[PDB]
Design an enzyme around this catalytic site. Structure first.
Site, PDB file in Angstrom:
ATOM      1  N   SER A 199      -5.851   3.219   3.955  1.00  0.00           N
ATOM      2  CA  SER A 199      -5.251   2.222   3.078  1.00  0.00           C
ATOM      3  C   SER A 199      -6.321   1.377   2.379  1.00  0.00           C
ATOM      4  O   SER A 199      -6.132   0.188   2.135  1.00  0.00           O
ATOM      5  CB  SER A 199      -4.334   1.327   3.903  1.00  0.00           C
ATOM      6  OG  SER A 199      -3.224   0.945   3.127  1.00  0.00           O
ATOM      7  N   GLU A 233      -4.705  -3.030  -7.140  1.00  0.00           N
ATOM      8  CA  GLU A 233      -4.990  -3.919  -6.018  1.00  0.00           C
ATOM      9  C   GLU A 233      -5.667  -5.227  -6.422  1.00  0.00           C
ATOM     10  O   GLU A 233      -5.333  -6.294  -5.912  1.00  0.00           O
ATOM     11  CB  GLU A 233      -5.841  -3.181  -4.998  1.00  0.00           C
ATOM     12  CG  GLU A 233      -5.069  -2.160  -4.224  1.00  0.00           C
ATOM     13  CD  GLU A 233      -4.051  -2.802  -3.325  1.00  0.00           C
ATOM     14  OE1 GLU A 233      -4.125  -4.035  -3.122  1.00  0.00           O
ATOM     15  OE2 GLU A 233      -3.182  -2.082  -2.798  1.00  0.00           O
ATOM     16  N   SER A 247       0.759  -1.256   0.000  1.00  0.00           N
ATOM     17  CA  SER A 247       0.000   0.000   0.000  1.00  0.00           C
ATOM     18  C   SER A 247       0.791   1.307   0.000  1.00  0.00           C
ATOM     19  O   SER A 247       0.204   2.390  -0.067  1.00  0.00           O
ATOM     20  CB  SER A 247      -1.007   0.000   1.149  1.00  0.00           C
ATOM     21  OG  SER A 247      -2.029  -0.960   0.899  1.00  0.00           O
ATOM     22  N   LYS A 253      -0.031   3.967  -2.658  1.00  0.00           N
ATOM     23  CA  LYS A 253      -1.229   4.804  -2.589  1.00  0.00           C
ATOM     24  C   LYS A 253      -0.782   6.255  -2.365  1.00  0.00           C
ATOM     25  O   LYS A 253      -1.537   7.191  -2.600  1.00  0.00           O
ATOM     26  CB  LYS A 253      -2.165   4.320  -1.473  1.00  0.00           C
ATOM     27  CG  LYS A 253      -2.890   3.047  -1.898  1.00  0.00           C
ATOM     28  CD  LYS A 253      -3.458   2.246  -0.752  1.00  0.00           C
ATOM     29  CE  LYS A 253      -4.023   0.944  -1.278  1.00  0.00           C
ATOM     30  NZ  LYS A 253      -4.362   0.018  -0.186  1.00  0.00           N
TER      31      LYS A 253
END
Length: 278
Positions: A108, A144, A44, A47
Protein backbone atom coordinates in the site's frame (compact mmCIF):
# COMPACT_ATOMS: atom_id res chain seq x y z
CA UNK A 1 -30.44 -14.20 -0.08
CA UNK A 2 -32.60 -12.60 2.64
CA UNK A 3 -31.16 -14.81 5.40
CA UNK A 4 -27.54 -13.70 4.79
CA UNK A 5 -28.65 -10.07 4.59
CA UNK A 6 -30.29 -10.36 7.98
CA UNK A 7 -27.19 -11.99 9.51
CA UNK A 8 -24.94 -9.24 8.21
CA UNK A 9 -27.30 -6.53 9.42
CA UNK A 10 -27.11 -8.03 12.93
CA UNK A 11 -23.39 -7.25 12.89
CA UNK A 12 -23.60 -3.60 11.80
CA UNK A 13 -26.65 -2.47 13.77
CA UNK A 14 -25.50 -0.89 17.03
CA UNK A 15 -22.02 0.06 15.72
CA UNK A 16 -21.25 3.77 15.46
CA UNK A 17 -20.26 3.62 11.79
CA UNK A 18 -21.87 3.30 8.36
CA UNK A 19 -21.05 -0.05 6.74
CA UNK A 20 -21.27 -1.04 3.08
CA UNK A 21 -21.04 -4.70 2.06
CA UNK A 22 -20.99 -6.60 -1.25
CA UNK A 23 -21.05 -10.43 -1.28
CA UNK A 24 -21.00 -12.43 -4.51
CA UNK A 25 -20.85 -16.22 -4.23
CA UNK A 26 -20.05 -18.54 -7.11
CA UNK A 27 -23.69 -19.62 -7.67
CA UNK A 28 -25.23 -16.15 -7.31
CA UNK A 29 -26.61 -14.30 -10.33
CA UNK A 30 -26.44 -10.91 -8.57
CA UNK A 31 -24.32 -9.77 -5.62
CA UNK A 32 -25.90 -9.07 -2.24
CA UNK A 33 -25.43 -5.36 -1.47
CA UNK A 34 -25.81 -3.67 1.92
CA UNK A 35 -26.21 0.16 1.74
CA UNK A 36 -26.25 0.34 -2.08
CA UNK A 37 -26.83 4.09 -2.36
CA UNK A 38 -24.09 5.36 -0.07
CA UNK A 39 -20.72 6.69 -1.36
CA UNK A 40 -17.71 5.06 0.36
CA UNK A 41 -14.21 6.65 0.46
CA UNK A 42 -11.80 4.16 -1.06
CA UNK A 43 -8.50 5.23 0.50
CA UNK A 44 -5.83 2.72 -0.76
CA UNK A 45 -8.39 0.37 -2.28
CA UNK A 46 -7.98 2.27 -5.59
CA UNK A 47 -4.39 1.00 -5.89
CA UNK A 48 -6.12 -2.17 -7.15
CA UNK A 49 -7.77 -0.36 -10.07
CA UNK A 50 -4.50 1.48 -10.78
CA UNK A 51 -2.51 -1.80 -10.94
CA UNK A 52 -5.03 -3.15 -13.46
CA UNK A 53 -4.65 -0.07 -15.69
CA UNK A 54 -0.86 -0.28 -15.54
CA UNK A 55 -0.80 -4.03 -16.30
CA UNK A 56 -3.28 -3.43 -19.09
CA UNK A 57 -0.77 -0.97 -20.65
CA UNK A 58 2.02 -3.54 -20.22
CA UNK A 59 -0.22 -6.11 -22.00
CA UNK A 60 -0.63 -3.62 -24.85
CA UNK A 61 3.10 -3.11 -25.06
CA UNK A 62 2.80 0.58 -24.11
CA UNK A 63 4.79 0.06 -20.88
CA UNK A 64 7.38 -2.56 -19.86
CA UNK A 65 7.58 -4.25 -16.45
CA UNK A 66 11.32 -3.41 -16.37
CA UNK A 67 10.89 0.19 -17.45
CA UNK A 68 12.44 2.07 -14.55
CA UNK A 69 11.71 5.37 -12.85
CA UNK A 70 14.29 7.72 -11.31
CA UNK A 71 13.27 8.53 -7.69
CA UNK A 72 14.56 11.72 -6.06
CA UNK A 73 14.15 11.36 -2.30
CA UNK A 74 13.65 15.13 -1.93
CA UNK A 75 10.97 15.45 -4.57
CA UNK A 76 8.59 12.64 -3.62
CA UNK A 77 5.69 13.07 -1.14
CA UNK A 78 7.32 13.49 2.26
CA UNK A 79 6.27 11.87 5.53
CA UNK A 80 3.70 9.41 4.26
CA UNK A 81 3.62 5.60 4.26
CA UNK A 82 6.24 4.64 1.63
CA UNK A 83 8.19 1.40 2.39
CA UNK A 84 9.93 1.69 -1.01
CA UNK A 85 11.93 4.67 0.34
CA UNK A 86 13.42 2.35 2.92
CA UNK A 87 14.23 -0.43 0.45
CA UNK A 88 16.82 1.67 -1.37
CA UNK A 89 19.59 3.92 -0.11
CA UNK A 90 20.62 7.23 -1.58
CA UNK A 91 19.04 10.51 -2.43
CA UNK A 92 18.50 9.27 -5.93
CA UNK A 93 17.88 5.72 -7.18
CA UNK A 94 15.88 3.97 -9.96
CA UNK A 95 13.09 1.38 -9.59
CA UNK A 96 11.37 -0.83 -12.19
CA UNK A 97 7.61 -0.68 -12.81
CA UNK A 98 7.34 -4.33 -11.62
CA UNK A 99 8.50 -3.33 -8.16
CA UNK A 100 6.47 -0.13 -7.96
CA UNK A 101 3.37 -2.25 -8.65
CA UNK A 102 4.32 -4.76 -6.00
CA UNK A 103 4.90 -2.04 -3.40
CA UNK A 104 1.70 -0.15 -4.25
CA UNK A 105 -0.47 -3.26 -4.06
CA UNK A 106 1.14 -5.49 -1.42
CA UNK A 107 2.53 -2.73 0.81
CA UNK A 108 0.00 0.00 0.00
CA UNK A 109 2.96 2.31 -0.77
CA UNK A 110 1.89 5.94 -1.37
CA UNK A 111 5.01 7.09 -3.27
CA UNK A 112 4.95 4.03 -5.58
CA UNK A 113 1.27 4.79 -6.26
CA UNK A 114 1.85 8.38 -7.42
CA UNK A 115 4.89 7.43 -9.50
CA UNK A 116 2.65 4.93 -11.38
CA UNK A 117 -0.05 7.60 -11.84
CA UNK A 118 2.59 9.73 -13.61
CA UNK A 119 3.28 7.04 -16.18
CA UNK A 120 -0.35 6.76 -17.33
CA UNK A 121 -1.81 10.28 -17.28
CA UNK A 122 -3.00 10.63 -13.67
CA UNK A 123 -6.37 10.13 -11.90
CA UNK A 124 -8.22 11.17 -15.09
CA UNK A 125 -6.64 8.25 -16.97
CA UNK A 126 -7.72 5.82 -14.25
CA UNK A 127 -11.26 7.17 -14.22
CA UNK A 128 -11.51 6.66 -18.02
CA UNK A 129 -10.23 3.09 -17.66
CA UNK A 130 -12.80 2.26 -14.99
CA UNK A 131 -15.69 3.72 -17.01
CA UNK A 132 -14.42 1.80 -20.04
CA UNK A 133 -15.05 -1.47 -18.08
CA UNK A 134 -18.66 -0.38 -17.64
CA UNK A 135 -18.32 0.59 -13.98
CA UNK A 136 -20.12 3.92 -13.49
CA UNK A 137 -20.30 4.05 -9.70
CA UNK A 138 -16.63 4.57 -8.82
CA UNK A 139 -14.97 7.99 -9.01
CA UNK A 140 -11.25 8.78 -9.04
CA UNK A 141 -10.20 12.43 -9.09
CA UNK A 142 -7.14 12.65 -6.86
CA UNK A 143 -3.78 11.03 -6.27
CA UNK A 144 -2.16 10.38 -2.86
CA UNK A 145 -0.36 13.73 -2.70
CA UNK A 146 -3.63 15.63 -3.28
CA UNK A 147 -5.42 13.44 -0.74
CA UNK A 148 -2.57 14.20 1.67
CA UNK A 149 -2.92 17.95 1.10
CA UNK A 150 -6.63 18.15 1.91
CA UNK A 151 -8.46 15.55 4.03
CA UNK A 152 -11.85 16.24 2.37
CA UNK A 153 -10.49 15.00 -0.96
CA UNK A 154 -10.51 11.37 0.18
CA UNK A 155 -14.31 11.47 -0.05
CA UNK A 156 -14.03 12.37 -3.74
CA UNK A 157 -12.27 9.07 -4.57
CA UNK A 158 -15.36 6.99 -3.81
CA UNK A 159 -17.20 3.86 -4.82
CA UNK A 160 -20.67 2.37 -4.34
CA UNK A 161 -20.85 -1.30 -3.23
CA UNK A 162 -22.07 -2.25 -6.70
CA UNK A 163 -18.89 -0.63 -8.04
CA UNK A 164 -16.77 -2.66 -5.58
CA UNK A 165 -18.52 -5.90 -6.60
CA UNK A 166 -17.97 -5.19 -10.31
CA UNK A 167 -14.24 -4.53 -10.05
CA UNK A 168 -13.79 -7.82 -8.15
CA UNK A 169 -15.92 -9.66 -10.76
CA UNK A 170 -13.97 -8.18 -13.70
CA UNK A 171 -10.73 -9.21 -12.10
CA UNK A 172 -12.07 -12.66 -11.18
CA UNK A 173 -13.31 -13.34 -14.72
CA UNK A 174 -9.73 -13.03 -15.96
CA UNK A 175 -11.08 -11.18 -19.02
CA UNK A 176 -9.24 -7.83 -18.55
CA UNK A 177 -5.60 -8.96 -18.34
CA UNK A 178 -3.23 -11.43 -20.02
CA UNK A 179 -2.57 -14.66 -18.12
CA UNK A 180 0.80 -13.30 -17.03
CA UNK A 181 -0.58 -9.99 -15.69
CA UNK A 182 -3.44 -11.76 -13.95
CA UNK A 183 -1.01 -14.14 -12.18
CA UNK A 184 1.19 -11.24 -11.06
CA UNK A 185 -1.70 -9.25 -9.61
CA UNK A 186 -3.10 -12.33 -7.83
CA UNK A 187 0.39 -12.85 -6.37
CA UNK A 188 0.67 -9.31 -4.98
CA UNK A 189 -2.86 -9.44 -3.52
CA UNK A 190 -2.25 -12.79 -1.78
CA UNK A 191 1.08 -11.50 -0.43
CA UNK A 192 -0.45 -8.29 1.02
CA UNK A 193 0.98 -7.62 4.49
CA UNK A 194 -1.64 -5.04 5.47
CA UNK A 195 -4.88 -5.74 7.33
CA UNK A 196 -4.30 -9.34 8.44
CA UNK A 197 -7.17 -9.03 10.97
CA UNK A 198 -9.81 -7.89 8.45
CA UNK A 199 -11.27 -10.24 5.75
CA UNK A 200 -8.77 -12.94 6.85
CA UNK A 201 -9.44 -12.40 10.55
CA UNK A 202 -11.75 -15.32 11.40
CA UNK A 203 -11.22 -17.58 8.38
CA UNK A 204 -9.58 -20.96 8.85
CA UNK A 205 -5.79 -21.32 8.66
CA UNK A 206 -4.75 -22.02 5.12
CA UNK A 207 -7.64 -20.19 3.40
CA UNK A 208 -6.32 -18.40 0.30
CA UNK A 209 -7.39 -14.76 0.23
CA UNK A 210 -6.32 -12.18 -2.38
CA UNK A 211 -7.23 -8.72 -1.03
CA UNK A 212 -6.49 -4.99 -0.86
CA UNK A 213 -7.01 -2.80 2.22
CA UNK A 214 -7.79 0.88 2.60
CA UNK A 215 -7.44 2.95 5.82
CA UNK A 216 -7.47 6.58 6.97
CA UNK A 217 -6.06 8.17 10.13
CA UNK A 218 -8.30 9.31 13.03
CA UNK A 219 -9.25 12.90 12.22
CA UNK A 220 -11.91 15.04 13.84
CA UNK A 221 -12.80 12.15 16.14
CA UNK A 222 -13.53 9.49 13.50
CA UNK A 223 -11.86 7.12 11.04
CA UNK A 224 -13.25 8.06 7.64
CA UNK A 225 -12.54 4.67 6.11
CA UNK A 226 -11.54 1.14 7.18
CA UNK A 227 -11.90 -1.11 4.10
CA UNK A 228 -10.92 -4.51 2.75
CA UNK A 229 -12.10 -6.19 -0.43
CA UNK A 230 -11.00 -9.42 -2.00
CA UNK A 231 -11.49 -12.95 -3.22
CA UNK A 232 -11.70 -15.90 -0.85
CA UNK A 233 -11.17 -19.38 -2.31
CA UNK A 234 -13.77 -21.86 -0.98
CA UNK A 235 -12.90 -25.47 -0.03
CA UNK A 236 -13.91 -26.56 -3.53
CA UNK A 237 -11.56 -23.99 -5.08
CA UNK A 238 -14.40 -21.68 -6.24
CA UNK A 239 -14.24 -17.93 -5.55
CA UNK A 240 -16.25 -15.92 -3.06
CA UNK A 241 -16.07 -12.12 -3.60
CA UNK A 242 -16.46 -9.96 -0.46
CA UNK A 243 -16.00 -6.21 0.03
CA UNK A 244 -16.57 -4.42 3.36
CA UNK A 245 -16.22 -0.64 3.74
CA UNK A 246 -16.58 0.91 7.20
CA UNK A 247 -17.17 4.65 6.90
CA UNK A 248 -17.07 7.54 9.40
CA UNK A 249 -16.59 5.32 12.41
CA UNK A 250 -16.51 6.42 16.02
CA UNK A 251 -15.62 2.87 17.16
CA UNK A 252 -12.10 1.67 18.16
CA UNK A 253 -9.69 0.58 15.42
CA UNK A 254 -10.01 -2.98 16.74
CA UNK A 255 -13.79 -2.86 16.43
CA UNK A 256 -13.62 -1.52 12.88
CA UNK A 257 -11.48 -4.46 11.81
CA UNK A 258 -13.64 -6.99 13.72
CA UNK A 259 -16.75 -5.79 11.80
CA UNK A 260 -14.95 -6.68 8.57
CA UNK A 261 -13.70 -10.04 9.92
CA UNK A 262 -17.20 -10.97 11.17
CA UNK A 263 -18.91 -10.06 7.95
CA UNK A 264 -16.35 -12.14 5.98
CA UNK A 265 -16.78 -15.11 8.30
CA UNK A 266 -20.58 -14.89 8.12
CA UNK A 267 -20.47 -14.86 4.28
CA UNK A 268 -18.01 -17.76 4.24
CA UNK A 269 -20.13 -19.89 6.64
CA UNK A 270 -23.18 -19.14 4.50
CA UNK A 271 -21.39 -20.54 1.44
CA UNK A 272 -20.55 -23.70 3.42
CA UNK A 273 -24.26 -23.97 4.35
CA UNK A 274 -25.10 -24.01 0.59
CA UNK A 275 -22.37 -26.61 -0.17
CA UNK A 276 -23.78 -28.58 2.77
CA UNK A 277 -27.27 -28.67 1.24
CA UNK A 278 -26.56 -28.70 -2.52
Amino acid sequence: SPLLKEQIESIVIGKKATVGVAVWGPDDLEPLLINPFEKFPMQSVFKLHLAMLVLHQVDQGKLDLNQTVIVNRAKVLQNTWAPIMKAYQGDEFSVPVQQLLQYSVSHSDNVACDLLFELVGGPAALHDYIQSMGIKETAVVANEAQMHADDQVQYQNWTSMKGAAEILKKFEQKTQLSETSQALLWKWMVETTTGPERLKGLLPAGTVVAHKTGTSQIKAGKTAATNDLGIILLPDGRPLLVAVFVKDSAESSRTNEAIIAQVAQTAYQFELKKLSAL
